[PDB]
């Protein structure tokens, strides 16, 4: 019984292996060679926001592109208005120890957690004028490493626990939890129309989980170590996923396979943290080695290099309008890049 | 400028509450909490799945020591967070093999190859019990030696010690018998020895 | 819930001193500037004092300089001294909070009785009131001497309602965006010098007093106040 089901399994990823090679009649690559490269796309720092005391382990813009959030070890998660460096909000953590935040897309709330295996729902609107907890979510096994709104009622987190789980922030139960990983799913990004999102795990593999029947649908393989982060291509049909192998990578969705690889023989720093610009054709790494650079997705050749920080960069996200690129640090400090 | 002028406020506000926070907060002294299960680590915090931290104040210094050995999660992918802590406090079991493998891991990790361990070895009595009945053998089968305390307690010291390879690092051995109260006096000895070898080293001295 | 309660009303003799205390609960007091308008017996409000949060600048109006305090247990007090004839009014108790995306003078107080024995933007409503029927539409309009659309791209126009027998209360803050709990069928219209507040499918409880405030700079000048009255 036990040997034939292990057999049947290896068949079938024999069979889904052939299928992707099979598919897999040209490269993105070979295809874009004829495309113009974007050249030495340089820029500058144009705000510093000053202010945290301690390593930033996360930064996320709010929809309205103007209002930043940042959290960081000292036990505040402060909100920045990023056109005047002002801080809004200063949020007093109940557990220093912070992994992730978030912005809800309509702004009223901010989500908070880390190894607490708790995520904790800020709310930004309250009558009594102060932020105030409005729910803690509770339920995970290991330490919560990202965190995502669907909208204002629900929103996903993955864990390190194996478990990536949807909220019903309204109750404070899970709705539906998703099974599959081997490690730790360390990273977590959702779909632009939000019907499905991908996860990256620990045990070198990403996979599409549909948020509403949740099921898993399709796992992409080729990392040889952790992944890091990962995010979604604009279009919603590839995601970058970068990997602590000192490598990031752009897989197809409908194509079920990777496409093109981002590495430099004078890279050797895992990745933390992805992004793409609003086209797409940036996709901006950040790297333990303090630098941050940028590549030509679709030419898969760097195009510049964000250094500007004193220890490695922990977070980093272009805006929603895609005006500005921000980058969160260990040095405490998230610089503004335009 | 407009009403800004009264969010320019609020922000400074906020700013100045912020560093009075961080002000206040700068006189703690983090310690990183470790070993194996019913290693000790309960009963000296009697004594004086989420982390668990444990605070107290001795002479002046308010330390914060951190249980992260909840965690059911592998600890390279959170281990980073402790990374800033003044020391490690190891300990050990004598009464009860593979904290010498989780010591191997930690002590020579990437992020703390800069951080002394501080090593409390307890049990102490009931390992004296213990060896009355049987030697080191059945836990070390390389020992060769006599059967009494003072040579198998260190000996096990030594194979702890053995573990470090970084030289800008020191451990600080102690052997707690699960009923003196002094532990927090060594660990306030360790910790200001600690310190005053990170002053001359910021002082581009040491 | 939020409750804003002042006392220190009755009468005084001309030349006197008085205090007016303000009581705040259910909020973080600590956190709000606080206003303090008062309004004449038969006229409109005007703006008298501005303690902003921690104490840290304080405006008073250019009829009260010198005359008046305002010092902040959760309550806010207004010291007056010298009182003239003039300085009869019902004094409200105005919490203020600025931030980006805020939503100043959100909740008034509801106010004390008192009675005795050229530079600032001026802004005007045309119209002294405009009858009106339930279900249909009504607009009130309202402007002012100086552009209220600064250069960070904000227009500071406030909209305010006072229902007769009640305090007024936030509609529209910034000529634009519309109040918590008010419904939507008010919108804010007009950007520039000229600003409309347009009321769709009118109801009786829209029924009361309308005021139109600048917030560009002190002090804070208040329209002449059109009424709507019903039929």
């Known amino acids: 019984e036990l040997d034939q089901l292990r057999q049947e399994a290896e068949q079938l990823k024999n069979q889904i292996r052939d299928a992707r090679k099979a598919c897999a009649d040209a490269t993105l690559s070979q295809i874009t060679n004829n495309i113009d490269p974007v050249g030495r796309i340089q820029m500058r720092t144009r705000r510093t926001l000053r202010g945290h005391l301690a390593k930033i382990y996360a930064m996320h813009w709010g929809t309205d592109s103007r209002l930043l959030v940042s959290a960081s070890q000292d036990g505040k998660l402060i909100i920045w208005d990023s056109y005047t460096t002002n801080k809004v909000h200063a949020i007093p953590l109940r557990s220093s120890w912070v992994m992730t935040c978030a912005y809800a897309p309509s702004g009223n709330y901010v989500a908070c957690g880390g190894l607490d295996n708790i995520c904790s729902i800020y709310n930004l609107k309250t009558r009594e004028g102060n932020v105030r907890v409005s729910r803690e979510l509770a339920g995970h096994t290991g330490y919560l490493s990202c965190c995502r709104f669907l909208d204002d009622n629900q929103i996903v987190t993955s864990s390190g626990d194996t478990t990536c789980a949807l909220w019903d922030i309204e109750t404070g139960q899970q709705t539906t939890t998703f099974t599959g990983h081997t490690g730790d799913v360390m990273s977590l990004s959702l779909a632009p129309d939000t019907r499905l999102f991908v996860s990256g795990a620990c045990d070198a593999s990403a996979k599409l989980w549909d948020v509403r029947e949740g099921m898993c649908r399709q796992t992409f393989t080729g990392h040889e170590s952790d992944i890091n982060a990962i995010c979604f291509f604009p279009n919603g049909n590839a995601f970058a996923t970068g990997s602590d192998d000192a490598t990031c990578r752009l897989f197809d969705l409908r194509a079920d396979q990777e496409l093109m690889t981002y590495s430099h023989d004078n890279i050797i720093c895992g990745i933390t943290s992805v992004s793409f610009s609003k086209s797409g054709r940036l996709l901006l790494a950040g790297y333990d080695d303090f630098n941050c650079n940028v590549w030509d997705a679709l030419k898969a050749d760097r195009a510049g290099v964000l250094a500007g920080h004193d220890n490695r960069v922990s977070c980093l996200g272009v805006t929603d309008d895609g005006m500005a690129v921000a980058t969160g640090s260990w040095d405490s400090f998230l610089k503004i890049w335009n | 400028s407009a009403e800004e002028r009264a969010a320019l406020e609020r922000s400074k506000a906020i700013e100045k509450n912020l560093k009075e926070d961080g002000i206040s907060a700068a006189k703690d002294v983090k310690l990183l909490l470790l070993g194996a299960d019913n290693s000790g680590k309960s009963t000296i915090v009697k004594q004086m799945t989420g982390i668990v931290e444990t605070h107290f104040t001795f002479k002046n210094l308010h330390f914060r020591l951190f249980d992260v050995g909840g965690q059911r999660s592998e600890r390279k992918k959170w281990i980073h967070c402790f990374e800033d802590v003044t020391a490690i406090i190891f300990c050990v079991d004598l009464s009860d093999h593979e904290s010498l493998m989780l010591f191997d891991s930690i002590c020579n990790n990437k992020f703390f190859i800069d951080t002394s361990i501080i090593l409390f070895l307890n049990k102490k009595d009931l390992f004296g019990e213990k060896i009355k009945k049987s030697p080191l053998t059945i836990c070390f089968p390389e020992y060769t030696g006599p059967n009494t305390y003072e040579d198998a307690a260190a000996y096990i010291q030594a194979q702890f010690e053995s573990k470090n390879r970084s030289p800008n690092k020191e451990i600080y051995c102690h052997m707690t018998c699960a009923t003196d109260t002094n532990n927090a006096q060594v660990i306030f000895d360790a910790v200001t020895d600690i310190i005053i070898a990170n002053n001359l080293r910021g002082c581009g001295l040491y | 819930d939020v409750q804003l309660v002042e006392s220190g009303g009755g009468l005084v003799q001309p030349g006197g001193s008085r205090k007016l205390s303000c009581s705040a609960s259910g909020f973080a007091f600590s956190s709000f500037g606080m206003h303090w308008v008062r309004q004449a017996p038969e006229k409109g409000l005007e703006w008298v004092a501005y303690?902003?949060?921690?104490?840290?600048?304080?405006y008073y109006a250019d009829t009260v300089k010198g005359r008046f305090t305002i010092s902040r247990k959760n309550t806010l007090f207004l010291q007056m001294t010298s009182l003239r004839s003039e300085d009869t009014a019902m004094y409200y108790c105005?919490?203020?909070?600025?931030?980006?995306?805020?939503?100043?003078?959100?909740?008034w107080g509801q106010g004390t009785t008192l009675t005795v024995s050229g530079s600032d933007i001026v802004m005007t409503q045309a119209t002294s009131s405009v009858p009106v029927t339930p279900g249909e539409s009504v607009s009130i309009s309202c402007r002012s001497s100086?552009?209220?659309?600064?250069?960070?791209?904000?227009?500071?126009l406030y909209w305010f309602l006072q229902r007769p027998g009640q305090s007024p209360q936030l509609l529209i803050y910034?000529?634009?965006n519309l109040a918590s709990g008010v419904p939507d069928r008010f919108s804010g219209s007009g950007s520039g010098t000229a600003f409309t507040l347009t009321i769709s499918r009118l109801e009786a409880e829209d029924v009361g007093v309308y005021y139109c405030?600048?917030?560009?700079?002190?002090?804070?000048?208040f329209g002449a106040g059109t009424k709507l009255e019903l039929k």
């Open positions: 405030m600048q917030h560009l700079e002190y002090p804070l000048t």
């Open positions: 100086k552009s209220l659309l600064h250069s960070n791209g904000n227009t500071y």
């Open positions: 910034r000529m634009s």
């Open positions: 303690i902003s949060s921690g104490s840290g600048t304080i």
């Open positions: 105005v919490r203020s909070i600025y931030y980006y995306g805020s939503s100043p003078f959100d909740f």
